[PDB]
Subunit: 96 residues, 4 copies
Amino acid sequence: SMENLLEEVEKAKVIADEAVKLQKEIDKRCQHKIAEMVALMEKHKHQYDKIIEERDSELGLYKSKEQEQSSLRASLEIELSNLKAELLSVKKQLEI
Amino acid sequence: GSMENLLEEVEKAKVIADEAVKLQKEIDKRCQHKIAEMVALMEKHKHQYDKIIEERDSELGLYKSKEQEQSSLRASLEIELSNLKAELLSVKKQL
Amino acid sequence: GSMENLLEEVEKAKVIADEAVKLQKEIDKRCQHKIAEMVALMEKHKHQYDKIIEERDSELGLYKSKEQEQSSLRASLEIELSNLKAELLSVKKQLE
Amino acid sequence: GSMENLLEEVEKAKVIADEAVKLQKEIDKRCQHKIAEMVALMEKHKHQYDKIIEERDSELGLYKSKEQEQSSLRASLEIELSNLKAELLSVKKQLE
């Protein structure tokens, strides 16, 4: 029974060794997965920061060109209206 | 009267130009709005990511502390089992 | 009195093992919640991106239709202005 | 001369229209370009999330099997400690 008792202590500490080793593999794999996901989030975070920051200068350029475009549009409408008015003048002159 | 035909043509050009300006603005603004929505989405995602990363960095000390406590418990168990085997060997030698 | 030391050591080892299991359950719990939260976040983002990319197609169809309407309105304006010039020349030379 | 400046106004309207089309093509080109860029970024990120989740999901079987084996080793350890306590009560009592 003494031999069996020492055998039981040996078996127990072997089981503890394997349990700790396996749990270390599990923990390392888990933290590895967390690290990969946070890494991907970091990269994406930085790219979005880049695009968000560029939107300011891009919006300034857009506003400049959009003002110039509103100028061209108003000019065309006014040109066509003036055309109509001078045509009216010509027509009433031709009534003579 | 040919003057009436001219007035009709000018009014036609005014209508065409007006619809073209209206459509032009509509296309333009639709594009700008699409860009704005995508930028807003990317900003939300960026802030969520920044929050997760910040929480991980803050709690890293606590996680490492608990892991150290765990490895200490494992080592203590190994030591108690070794002492158990040693004292059992002592008792066996006594008998 | 060495047997009492043996029983005390066995009870101590059992308490140690129980504390290791309790603490390890807290660790595994935290890792599981972290991975689950990040997977939920990335899956939500993946779906939102997929949706925007999916509706970009219909937005491109409407964009194409409206752009064709635009170019037709442009061509029509250029032609109406040319016909206008033609009749203006007709009246001008008629009155000369 | 009211006809000469009518023809002149017609030519001016043609010119203004052509300008407006050029400027608007510039505007729409930079806008559609920005859209293309952000859509390509979202496509890349969507496929990355899909890939990383498909990997975790594919290895969940190995994870679950090693975790079950881990819980098996924990149970084995509690069983061995219990057997030890019992045989040590037996041996202790056989002495006294």
